[PDB]
């Protein structure tokens, strides 16, 4: 109806919230019409068989499906029939811009493509993990959920975050039109509990310039 302007949302909520808790949830981020369009584009990508098994940074498991059971695709934002996903990504970028380097001491200059992820029920989830355990450049995780009338007591699928220095863990329901931010590093181990219905989410990872620069190294020697 009357959504907070992005500038105010960022400066008076997202920044103080992230700096206090390291987690920040914005409900009703883009509204029902835009959110439903995003759902339509995600369902079109899913229906065309475009999703692939989620992969891990260092492939050390027998099967990747032991750890994460989602199927995904990487969206740049300019593809045909992905216009509303590009709008979502530009809105996320606008919030990050408005934060003006006030997210900790991070200097955010870039991000990944969008990861469109589907947990196709059947008890699939993501075991407890850290998004950026060893300085690959990711400082903030940003996730947009798409599941209307999702009842965790029946479908599972809850995102449980375990923030360092907090007494309690934090349960995030994957609600339609919900936006989530959290620090990607070891402060926020987290897990997707098994889903028993089709669960859709769109993730973007923002990069700290200096750490990301150090991550991208080529050894012209053998090492």
């Amino acid at each position: 109806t009357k959504p907070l302007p992005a500038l105010k949302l960022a400066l008076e909520y997202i920044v103080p919230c992230m700096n206090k808790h390291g987690i920040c949830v914005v409900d009703d981020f883009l509204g029902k019409e835009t959110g439903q369009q995003i759902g339509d584009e995600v369902r079109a990508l899913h229906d065309t068989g475009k999703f692939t098994d989620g992969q891990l940074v260092s492939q050390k498991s027998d099967s990747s499906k032991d750890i994460r059971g989602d199927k995904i695709t990487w969206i740049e934002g300019k593809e045909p029939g992905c216009e509303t996903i590009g709008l979502l990504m530009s809105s996320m970028d606008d919030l990050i811009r408005h934060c003006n380097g006030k997210l900790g001491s991070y200097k955010i200059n870039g991000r990944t493509k969008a990861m469109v992820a589907c947990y196709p029920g059947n008890g699939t989830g993501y075991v407890r993990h850290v998004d950026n355990p060893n300085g690959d450049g990711r400082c903030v995780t940003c996730i947009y959920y798409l599941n209307k009338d999702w009842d965790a007591k029946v479908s599972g699928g809850i995102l449980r975050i375990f923030p360092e220095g907090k007494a309690q863990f934090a349960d995030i329901e994957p609600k339609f039109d919900r936006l989530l931010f959290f620090w990607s590093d070891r402060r926020n181990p987290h897990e997707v509990q098994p889903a028993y219905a089709t669960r859709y989410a769109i993730t973007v990872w923002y990069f700290d310039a200096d750490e990301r620069a150090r991550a991208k190294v080529k050894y012209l020697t053998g090492e």
Binding site: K2, P3, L4, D27, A170
Partner: peptide
């Protein structure tokens, strides 16, 4: 429109 700062959820609308 109001944020209990011990929480981490806020409705934009």
């Amino acid at each position: 429109x109001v944020w209990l700062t011990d929480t981490w959820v806020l409705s934009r609308t």
